[PDB]
Amino acid sequence: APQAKILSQAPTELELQVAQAFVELENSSPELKAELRPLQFKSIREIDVAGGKKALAIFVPVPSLAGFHKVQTKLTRELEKKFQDRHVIFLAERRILPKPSRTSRQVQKRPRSRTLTAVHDKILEDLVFPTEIVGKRVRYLVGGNKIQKVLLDSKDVQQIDYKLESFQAVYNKLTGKQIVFEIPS
RNA sequence: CUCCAAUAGCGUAUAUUAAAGUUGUUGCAGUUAAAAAGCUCGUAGUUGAACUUUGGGCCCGGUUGGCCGGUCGGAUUUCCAACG
């Protein structure tokens, strides 16, 4: 069955639910047979948004995040209607290699793409996927906590304008860092 | 003659230390008092932008998230995450 060939080996029941959501468009197929055939994903984590909704995180192997970005906007519409009370987002399963200490040595020098401070930057670029980020500010409060601030492009913002409350919860669950989104005009 | 200072000790000479921020690492000065090479290149020497992840528990402050409005769009904070 083509449902089971997307997930890793066995798991899980939730991975099948999104798997059926793909083949209802692969078998409908206005144009999607030429682009949704090779697209496959790795896992779903369910993140509880602070409101009544929840968030779906789709993890992509990333030789194919560019492939997913072709149908990203259209596919999210056909995932939100057949999965109510949810917000669907697409992320890439990136690898983070630990910083070498003066004792914990390795072989094979660690590329800058594997550093943790670069992977978290690529999460923000991939959470919001349209509306390219036009800036970042970090507030160091008097108390001692740090609050980021992501400035988004004003054009095409109406595709994610409701999902700013969801994105702050997702990035907190993966990084533990506070985010506020601000849209300059 | 009287008085002062130290006193079984007191003066003199030379050296040296403090004084001396008058050798300056701490810590000098260089327009006119002494002192910015006529100017530029240049080796040694001295100096050189930014960037690469947060596991023990308990008490304290916030800042977000709600269970909570008390109230005529703002007014108190507590029990709970983790967020450093």
PDB file of C-alpha atoms (C1' of nucleotides) in Angstrom:
ATOM      1  CA  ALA A   1       0.000   0.000   0.000  1.00  0.00           C
ATOM      2  CA  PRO A   2       1.255   3.506  -0.839  1.00  0.00           C
ATOM      3  CA  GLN A   3       0.034   4.718   2.566  1.00  0.00           C
ATOM      4  CA  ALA A   4       2.701   2.730   4.405  1.00  0.00           C
ATOM      5  CA  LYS A   5       5.587   3.724   2.128  1.00  0.00           C
ATOM      6  CA  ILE A   6       5.702   7.297   3.459  1.00  0.00           C
ATOM      7  CA  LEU A   7       6.273   6.580   7.173  1.00  0.00           C
ATOM      8  CA  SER A   8       9.538   5.162   8.499  1.00  0.00           C
ATOM      9  CA  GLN A   9       8.950   1.458   9.093  1.00  0.00           C
ATOM     10  CA  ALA A  10       5.975   0.799  11.425  1.00  0.00           C
ATOM     11  CA  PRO A  11       4.595   3.922  13.130  1.00  0.00           C
ATOM     12  CA  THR A  12       2.005   5.252  13.489  1.00  0.00           C
ATOM     13  CA  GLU A  13      -1.784   5.557  13.246  1.00  0.00           C
ATOM     14  CA  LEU A  14      -1.527   9.351  12.997  1.00  0.00           C
ATOM     15  CA  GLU A  15       0.951   9.000  10.126  1.00  0.00           C
ATOM     16  CA  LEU A  16      -1.723   7.038   8.241  1.00  0.00           C
ATOM     17  CA  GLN A  17      -4.282   9.826   8.727  1.00  0.00           C
ATOM     18  CA  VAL A  18      -2.099  12.319   6.872  1.00  0.00           C
ATOM     19  CA  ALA A  19      -1.187   9.539   4.427  1.00  0.00           C
ATOM     20  CA  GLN A  20      -4.828   9.150   3.387  1.00  0.00           C
ATOM     21  CA  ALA A  21      -5.009  12.937   3.035  1.00  0.00           C
ATOM     22  CA  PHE A  22      -2.329  12.768   0.326  1.00  0.00           C
ATOM     23  CA  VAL A  23      -3.829   9.968  -1.781  1.00  0.00           C
ATOM     24  CA  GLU A  24      -7.234  11.651  -1.906  1.00  0.00           C
ATOM     25  CA  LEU A  25      -5.418  14.338  -3.896  1.00  0.00           C
ATOM     26  CA  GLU A  26      -3.099  11.937  -5.734  1.00  0.00           C
ATOM     27  CA  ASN A  27      -6.136   9.978  -6.976  1.00  0.00           C
ATOM     28  CA  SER A  28      -8.079  13.172  -7.690  1.00  0.00           C
ATOM     29  CA  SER A  29      -5.060  14.616  -9.493  1.00  0.00           C
ATOM     30  CA  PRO A  30      -5.826  17.775 -11.482  1.00  0.00           C
ATOM     31  CA  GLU A  31      -2.079  18.333 -11.788  1.00  0.00           C
ATOM     32  CA  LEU A  32      -0.777  16.749  -8.581  1.00  0.00           C
ATOM     33  CA  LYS A  33       0.280  13.392 -10.047  1.00  0.00           C
ATOM     34  CA  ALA A  34       3.369  15.060 -11.537  1.00  0.00           C
ATOM     35  CA  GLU A  35       4.477  16.623  -8.236  1.00  0.00           C
ATOM     36  CA  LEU A  36       2.875  14.798  -5.288  1.00  0.00           C
ATOM     37  CA  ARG A  37       4.112  11.342  -6.341  1.00  0.00           C
ATOM     38  CA  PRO A  38       7.738  11.679  -5.097  1.00  0.00           C
ATOM     39  CA  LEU A  39       6.966  13.951  -2.131  1.00  0.00           C
ATOM     40  CA  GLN A  40       7.201  12.032   1.142  1.00  0.00           C
ATOM     41  CA  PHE A  41       7.597  13.020   4.786  1.00  0.00           C
ATOM     42  CA  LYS A  42       9.056  11.534   7.960  1.00  0.00           C
ATOM     43  CA  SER A  43       6.982  12.293  11.061  1.00  0.00           C
ATOM     44  CA  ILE A  44       4.219  14.297  12.720  1.00  0.00           C
ATOM     45  CA  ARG A  45       4.461  15.870  16.137  1.00  0.00           C
ATOM     46  CA  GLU A  46       1.217  17.229  17.570  1.00  0.00           C
ATOM     47  CA  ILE A  47       1.722  20.543  19.377  1.00  0.00           C
ATOM     48  CA  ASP A  48      -1.036  22.017  21.535  1.00  0.00           C
ATOM     49  CA  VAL A  49      -1.596  25.633  20.531  1.00  0.00           C
ATOM     50  CA  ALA A  50      -2.417  27.941  23.463  1.00  0.00           C
ATOM     51  CA  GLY A  51      -5.894  28.452  21.980  1.00  0.00           C
ATOM     52  CA  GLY A  52      -8.438  25.758  21.308  1.00  0.00           C
ATOM     53  CA  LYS A  53      -6.565  24.552  18.228  1.00  0.00           C
ATOM     54  CA  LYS A  54      -3.558  22.267  17.829  1.00  0.00           C
ATOM     55  CA  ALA A  55      -0.629  22.298  15.425  1.00  0.00           C
ATOM     56  CA  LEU A  56       0.599  19.673  12.965  1.00  0.00           C
ATOM     57  CA  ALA A  57       4.320  19.660  12.170  1.00  0.00           C
ATOM     58  CA  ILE A  58       5.305  17.817   8.989  1.00  0.00           C
ATOM     59  CA  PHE A  59       8.960  16.800   8.860  1.00  0.00           C
ATOM     60  CA  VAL A  60      10.623  16.607   5.436  1.00  0.00           C
ATOM     61  CA  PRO A  61      13.917  14.783   4.655  1.00  0.00           C
ATOM     62  CA  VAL A  62      15.335  17.988   2.953  1.00  0.00           C
ATOM     63  CA  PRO A  63      16.585  16.935  -0.296  1.00  0.00           C
ATOM     64  CA  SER A  64      12.926  17.745  -0.961  1.00  0.00           C
ATOM     65  CA  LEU A  65      11.924  20.864   0.977  1.00  0.00           C
ATOM     66  CA  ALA A  66      12.281  22.748  -2.304  1.00  0.00           C
ATOM     67  CA  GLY A  67       9.940  20.180  -3.830  1.00  0.00           C
ATOM     68  CA  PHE A  68       7.471  20.595  -0.973  1.00  0.00           C
ATOM     69  CA  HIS A  69       7.577  24.378  -1.357  1.00  0.00           C
ATOM     70  CA  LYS A  70       6.058  24.158  -4.846  1.00  0.00           C
ATOM     71  CA  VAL A  71       2.745  22.802  -3.541  1.00  0.00           C
ATOM     72  CA  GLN A  72       3.109  24.144   0.029  1.00  0.00           C
ATOM     73  CA  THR A  73       0.359  26.775  -0.088  1.00  0.00           C
ATOM     74  CA  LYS A  74      -2.157  24.630  -1.962  1.00  0.00           C
ATOM     75  CA  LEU A  75      -1.589  21.421   0.014  1.00  0.00           C
ATOM     76  CA  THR A  76      -2.095  23.148   3.369  1.00  0.00           C
ATOM     77  CA  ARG A  77      -5.623  24.116   2.308  1.00  0.00           C
ATOM     78  CA  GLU A  78      -6.453  20.488   1.545  1.00  0.00           C
ATOM     79  CA  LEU A  79      -5.030  19.448   4.918  1.00  0.00           C
ATOM     80  CA  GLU A  80      -6.807  22.000   7.107  1.00  0.00           C
ATOM     81  CA  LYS A  81     -10.301  21.209   5.819  1.00  0.00           C
ATOM     82  CA  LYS A  82     -10.129  17.436   6.258  1.00  0.00           C
ATOM     83  CA  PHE A  83      -8.362  17.880   9.613  1.00  0.00           C
ATOM     84  CA  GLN A  84     -10.411  20.345  11.624  1.00  0.00           C
ATOM     85  CA  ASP A  85      -9.148  22.018  14.815  1.00  0.00           C
ATOM     86  CA  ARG A  86      -5.594  21.849  13.412  1.00  0.00           C
ATOM     87  CA  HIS A  87      -2.891  24.007  11.846  1.00  0.00           C
ATOM     88  CA  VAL A  88      -0.552  22.277   9.392  1.00  0.00           C
ATOM     89  CA  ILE A  89       3.035  23.463   8.876  1.00  0.00           C
ATOM     90  CA  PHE A  90       6.003  21.956   7.051  1.00  0.00           C
ATOM     91  CA  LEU A  91       9.478  21.646   8.547  1.00  0.00           C
ATOM     92  CA  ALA A  92      12.708  19.970   7.484  1.00  0.00           C
ATOM     93  CA  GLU A  93      14.303  17.314   9.658  1.00  0.00           C
ATOM     94  CA  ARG A  94      17.705  18.913  10.172  1.00  0.00           C
ATOM     95  CA  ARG A  95      20.616  17.428  12.091  1.00  0.00           C
ATOM     96  CA  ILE A  96      22.328  19.270  14.950  1.00  0.00           C
ATOM     97  CA  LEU A  97      25.830  18.224  15.861  1.00  0.00           C
ATOM     98  CA  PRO A  98      27.138  18.978  19.359  1.00  0.00           C
ATOM     99  CA  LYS A  99      29.830  21.574  19.838  1.00  0.00           C
ATOM    100  CA  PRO A 100      33.220  19.906  20.396  1.00  0.00           C
ATOM    101  CA  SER A 101      34.581  20.474  23.869  1.00  0.00           C
ATOM    102  CA  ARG A 102      38.261  20.417  24.761  1.00  0.00           C
ATOM    103  CA  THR A 103      37.807  16.753  25.720  1.00  0.00           C
ATOM    104  CA  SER A 104      34.919  15.553  23.520  1.00  0.00           C
ATOM    105  CA  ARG A 105      36.885  15.396  20.277  1.00  0.00           C
ATOM    106  CA  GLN A 106      35.682  13.978  16.956  1.00  0.00           C
ATOM    107  CA  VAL A 107      36.673  13.481  13.337  1.00  0.00           C
ATOM    108  CA  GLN A 108      35.085  15.336  10.389  1.00  0.00           C
ATOM    109  CA  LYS A 109      34.914  19.071  11.211  1.00  0.00           C
ATOM    110  CA  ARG A 110      31.379  20.248  11.971  1.00  0.00           C
ATOM    111  CA  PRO A 111      29.814  22.282   9.154  1.00  0.00           C
ATOM    112  CA  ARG A 112      28.086  25.535  10.009  1.00  0.00           C
ATOM    113  CA  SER A 113      24.784  24.146   8.743  1.00  0.00           C
ATOM    114  CA  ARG A 114      24.819  21.603  11.576  1.00  0.00           C
ATOM    115  CA  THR A 115      25.265  24.160  14.349  1.00  0.00           C
ATOM    116  CA  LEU A 116      22.290  24.661  16.633  1.00  0.00           C
ATOM    117  CA  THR A 117      22.183  28.429  16.191  1.00  0.00           C
ATOM    118  CA  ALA A 118      21.833  27.922  12.430  1.00  0.00           C
ATOM    119  CA  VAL A 119      19.192  25.201  12.620  1.00  0.00           C
ATOM    120  CA  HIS A 120      16.903  27.338  14.786  1.00  0.00           C
ATOM    121  CA  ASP A 121      17.232  30.151  12.252  1.00  0.00           C
ATOM    122  CA  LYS A 122      16.159  27.740   9.525  1.00  0.00           C
ATOM    123  CA  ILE A 123      13.101  26.817  11.600  1.00  0.00           C
ATOM    124  CA  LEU A 124      11.797  30.400  11.502  1.00  0.00           C
ATOM    125  CA  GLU A 125      12.481  30.550   7.773  1.00  0.00           C
ATOM    126  CA  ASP A 126      10.453  27.343   7.386  1.00  0.00           C
ATOM    127  CA  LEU A 127       7.609  27.874   9.872  1.00  0.00           C
ATOM    128  CA  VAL A 128       6.127  30.806   8.049  1.00  0.00           C
ATOM    129  CA  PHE A 129       7.138  29.727   4.595  1.00  0.00           C
ATOM    130  CA  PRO A 130       5.765  32.662   2.484  1.00  0.00           C
ATOM    131  CA  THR A 131       6.297  36.280   3.712  1.00  0.00           C
ATOM    132  CA  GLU A 132      10.100  36.300   3.842  1.00  0.00           C
ATOM    133  CA  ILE A 133      11.539  37.592   7.099  1.00  0.00           C
ATOM    134  CA  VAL A 134      12.624  41.223   6.767  1.00  0.00           C
ATOM    135  CA  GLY A 135      14.386  41.492  10.108  1.00  0.00           C
ATOM    136  CA  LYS A 136      14.962  40.226  13.608  1.00  0.00           C
ATOM    137  CA  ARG A 137      15.259  41.933  16.971  1.00  0.00           C
ATOM    138  CA  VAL A 138      16.125  40.380  20.325  1.00  0.00           C
ATOM    139  CA  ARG A 139      15.012  42.048  23.544  1.00  0.00           C
ATOM    140  CA  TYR A 140      17.085  41.452  26.655  1.00  0.00           C
ATOM    141  CA  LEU A 141      14.599  42.320  29.375  1.00  0.00           C
ATOM    142  CA  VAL A 142      15.457  43.787  32.767  1.00  0.00           C
ATOM    143  CA  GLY A 143      14.356  40.601  34.520  1.00  0.00           C
ATOM    144  CA  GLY A 144      16.644  38.420  32.453  1.00  0.00           C
ATOM    145  CA  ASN A 145      14.558  36.611  29.866  1.00  0.00           C
ATOM    146  CA  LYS A 146      15.187  37.053  26.146  1.00  0.00           C
ATOM    147  CA  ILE A 147      12.365  37.734  23.693  1.00  0.00           C
ATOM    148  CA  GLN A 148      12.960  37.493  19.969  1.00  0.00           C
ATOM    149  CA  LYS A 149      10.964  39.480  17.446  1.00  0.00           C
ATOM    150  CA  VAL A 150      10.484  38.316  13.861  1.00  0.00           C
ATOM    151  CA  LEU A 151       9.519  40.983  11.341  1.00  0.00           C
ATOM    152  CA  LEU A 152       7.551  39.598   8.414  1.00  0.00           C
ATOM    153  CA  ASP A 153       6.973  40.842   4.893  1.00  0.00           C
ATOM    154  CA  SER A 154       3.678  42.688   4.580  1.00  0.00           C
ATOM    155  CA  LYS A 155       2.693  41.174   1.229  1.00  0.00           C
ATOM    156  CA  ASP A 156       0.954  37.763   1.084  1.00  0.00           C
ATOM    157  CA  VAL A 157       0.552  37.905   4.882  1.00  0.00           C
ATOM    158  CA  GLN A 158      -3.124  36.882   4.774  1.00  0.00           C
ATOM    159  CA  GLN A 159      -2.189  33.199   4.390  1.00  0.00           C
ATOM    160  CA  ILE A 160      -0.649  32.960   7.880  1.00  0.00           C
ATOM    161  CA  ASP A 161      -2.123  36.037   9.609  1.00  0.00           C
ATOM    162  CA  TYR A 162      -4.305  33.862  11.849  1.00  0.00           C
ATOM    163  CA  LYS A 163      -1.466  31.426  12.579  1.00  0.00           C
ATOM    164  CA  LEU A 164       0.853  33.794  14.479  1.00  0.00           C
ATOM    165  CA  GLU A 165      -0.575  32.492  17.753  1.00  0.00           C
ATOM    166  CA  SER A 166       0.135  28.933  16.646  1.00  0.00           C
ATOM    167  CA  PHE A 167       3.702  29.594  15.488  1.00  0.00           C
ATOM    168  CA  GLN A 168       4.814  30.982  18.858  1.00  0.00           C
ATOM    169  CA  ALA A 169       3.721  27.718  20.465  1.00  0.00           C
ATOM    170  CA  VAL A 170       5.490  25.511  17.908  1.00  0.00           C
ATOM    171  CA  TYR A 171       8.823  27.333  18.086  1.00  0.00           C
ATOM    172  CA  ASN A 172       8.612  27.255  21.876  1.00  0.00           C
ATOM    173  CA  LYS A 173       8.174  23.484  21.847  1.00  0.00           C
ATOM    174  CA  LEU A 174      11.164  22.906  19.573  1.00  0.00           C
ATOM    175  CA  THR A 175      13.574  25.573  20.835  1.00  0.00           C
ATOM    176  CA  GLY A 176      12.286  26.909  24.124  1.00  0.00           C
ATOM    177  CA  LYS A 177      12.648  30.504  22.931  1.00  0.00           C
ATOM    178  CA  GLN A 178       9.971  33.187  23.024  1.00  0.00           C
ATOM    179  CA  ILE A 179       8.804  34.752  19.757  1.00  0.00           C
ATOM    180  CA  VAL A 180       6.622  37.715  18.931  1.00  0.00           C
ATOM    181  CA  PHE A 181       5.756  38.395  15.301  1.00  0.00           C
ATOM    182  CA  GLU A 182       5.371  41.985  14.124  1.00  0.00           C
ATOM    183  CA  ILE A 183       4.192  43.099  10.685  1.00  0.00           C
ATOM    184  CA  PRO A 184       5.601  46.494   9.664  1.00  0.00           C
ATOM    185  CA  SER A 185       3.730  48.451   7.028  1.00  0.00           C
TER     186      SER A 185
ATOM    187  C1'   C B   1      72.654  86.748  79.091  1.00  0.00           C
ATOM    188  C1'   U B   2      68.138  84.332  78.050  1.00  0.00           C
ATOM    189  C1'   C B   3      65.549  80.705  75.277  1.00  0.00           C
ATOM    190  C1'   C B   4      64.678  76.237  71.745  1.00  0.00           C
ATOM    191  C1'   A B   5      65.448  70.926  69.893  1.00  0.00           C
ATOM    192  C1'   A B   6      67.168  65.874  70.735  1.00  0.00           C
ATOM    193  C1'   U B   7      69.523  63.756  74.908  1.00  0.00           C
ATOM    194  C1'   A B   8      74.188  59.589  76.947  1.00  0.00           C
ATOM    195  C1'   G B   9      74.046  61.101  72.972  1.00  0.00           C
ATOM    196  C1'   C B  10      74.373  65.026  69.226  1.00  0.00           C
ATOM    197  C1'   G B  11      76.619  67.414  64.887  1.00  0.00           C
ATOM    198  C1'   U B  12      79.441  66.931  59.993  1.00  0.00           C
ATOM    199  C1'   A B  13      80.821  64.220  55.043  1.00  0.00           C
ATOM    200  C1'   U B  14      79.807  60.709  51.314  1.00  0.00           C
ATOM    201  C1'   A B  15      76.478  56.966  49.464  1.00  0.00           C
ATOM    202  C1'   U B  16      71.527  55.063  49.209  1.00  0.00           C
ATOM    203  C1'   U B  17      65.922  54.746  49.973  1.00  0.00           C
ATOM    204  C1'   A B  18      61.292  57.711  50.797  1.00  0.00           C
ATOM    205  C1'   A B  19      60.023  62.319  49.286  1.00  0.00           C
ATOM    206  C1'   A B  20      60.032  61.537  43.129  1.00  0.00           C
ATOM    207  C1'   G B  21      53.463  61.145  39.345  1.00  0.00           C
ATOM    208  C1'   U B  22      61.557  64.490  38.792  1.00  0.00           C
ATOM    209  C1'   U B  23      61.866  57.386  35.053  1.00  0.00           C
ATOM    210  C1'   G B  24      55.872  57.056  35.243  1.00  0.00           C
ATOM    211  C1'   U B  25      53.360  48.726  34.304  1.00  0.00           C
ATOM    212  C1'   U B  26      50.295  50.922  38.141  1.00  0.00           C
ATOM    213  C1'   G B  27      51.560  56.422  36.731  1.00  0.00           C
ATOM    214  C1'   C B  28      54.734  61.575  33.546  1.00  0.00           C
ATOM    215  C1'   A B  29      55.319  64.828  29.478  1.00  0.00           C
ATOM    216  C1'   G B  30      55.952  66.382  23.860  1.00  0.00           C
ATOM    217  C1'   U B  31      50.984  73.639  20.125  1.00  0.00           C
ATOM    218  C1'   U B  32      53.860  77.882  22.981  1.00  0.00           C
ATOM    219  C1'   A B  33      57.848  75.710  29.224  1.00  0.00           C
ATOM    220  C1'   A B  34      62.727  70.275  27.360  1.00  0.00           C
ATOM    221  C1'   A B  35      60.731  67.017  23.619  1.00  0.00           C
ATOM    222  C1'   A B  36      56.181  64.572  17.002  1.00  0.00           C
ATOM    223  C1'   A B  37      61.779  61.978  12.609  1.00  0.00           C
ATOM    224  C1'   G B  38      60.761  66.667   6.240  1.00  0.00           C
ATOM    225  C1'   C B  39      57.710  62.958   4.038  1.00  0.00           C
ATOM    226  C1'   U B  40      56.223  58.163   2.449  1.00  0.00           C
ATOM    227  C1'   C B  41      57.260  52.780   1.819  1.00  0.00           C
ATOM    228  C1'   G B  42      58.736  48.659   4.570  1.00  0.00           C
ATOM    229  C1'   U B  43      61.050  43.576   7.496  1.00  0.00           C
ATOM    230  C1'   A B  44      61.548  41.979  12.531  1.00  0.00           C
ATOM    231  C1'   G B  45      58.462  43.401  16.824  1.00  0.00           C
ATOM    232  C1'   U B  46      53.771  44.863  18.990  1.00  0.00           C
ATOM    233  C1'   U B  47      48.495  44.794  17.878  1.00  0.00           C
ATOM    234  C1'   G B  48      44.361  42.992  15.018  1.00  0.00           C
ATOM    235  C1'   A B  49      36.023  42.807  13.052  1.00  0.00           C
ATOM    236  C1'   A B  50      32.029  39.349  13.834  1.00  0.00           C
ATOM    237  C1'   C B  51      30.333  34.024  13.849  1.00  0.00           C
ATOM    238  C1'   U B  52      30.040  27.607  15.968  1.00  0.00           C
ATOM    239  C1'   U B  53      24.047  24.410  21.953  1.00  0.00           C
ATOM    240  C1'   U B  54      20.775  25.341  27.506  1.00  0.00           C
ATOM    241  C1'   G B  55      20.040  18.031  32.152  1.00  0.00           C
ATOM    242  C1'   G B  56      20.191  17.286  40.403  1.00  0.00           C
ATOM    243  C1'   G B  57      16.902  19.311  43.924  1.00  0.00           C
ATOM    244  C1'   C B  58      14.999  23.404  46.842  1.00  0.00           C
ATOM    245  C1'   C B  59      13.694  29.130  47.807  1.00  0.00           C
ATOM    246  C1'   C B  60      13.223  34.482  44.911  1.00  0.00           C
ATOM    247  C1'   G B  61      11.849  37.973  40.861  1.00  0.00           C
ATOM    248  C1'   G B  62       9.501  38.640  36.648  1.00  0.00           C
ATOM    249  C1'   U B  63       6.609  36.785  30.819  1.00  0.00           C
ATOM    250  C1'   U B  64       4.395  34.975  28.366  1.00  0.00           C
ATOM    251  C1'   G B  65      -0.572  30.340  28.507  1.00  0.00           C
ATOM    252  C1'   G B  66      -5.027  29.812  30.215  1.00  0.00           C
ATOM    253  C1'   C B  67      -8.672  27.752  34.889  1.00  0.00           C
ATOM    254  C1'   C B  68     -10.011  32.151  36.916  1.00  0.00           C
ATOM    255  C1'   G B  69     -13.226  39.895  36.561  1.00  0.00           C
ATOM    256  C1'   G B  70     -13.641  42.304  40.984  1.00  0.00           C
ATOM    257  C1'   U B  71     -15.298  46.118  37.215  1.00  0.00           C
ATOM    258  C1'   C B  72     -17.151  50.636  35.397  1.00  0.00           C
ATOM    259  C1'   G B  73     -11.071  49.717  26.624  1.00  0.00           C
ATOM    260  C1'   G B  74      -7.731  49.270  31.416  1.00  0.00           C
ATOM    261  C1'   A B  75      -7.534  47.780  37.724  1.00  0.00           C
ATOM    262  C1'   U B  76      -5.076  42.558  41.908  1.00  0.00           C
ATOM    263  C1'   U B  77      -2.398  38.424  41.614  1.00  0.00           C
ATOM    264  C1'   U B  78      -2.451  33.455  43.083  1.00  0.00           C
ATOM    265  C1'   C B  79      -2.303  26.721  42.020  1.00  0.00           C
ATOM    266  C1'   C B  80       0.046  24.711  37.600  1.00  0.00           C
ATOM    267  C1'   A B  81       3.781  24.046  32.937  1.00  0.00           C
ATOM    268  C1'   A B  82       8.851  25.814  30.764  1.00  0.00           C
ATOM    269  C1'   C B  83      11.123  30.462  29.643  1.00  0.00           C
ATOM    270  C1'   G B  84      15.742  31.677  30.369  1.00  0.00           C
TER     271        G B  84
END
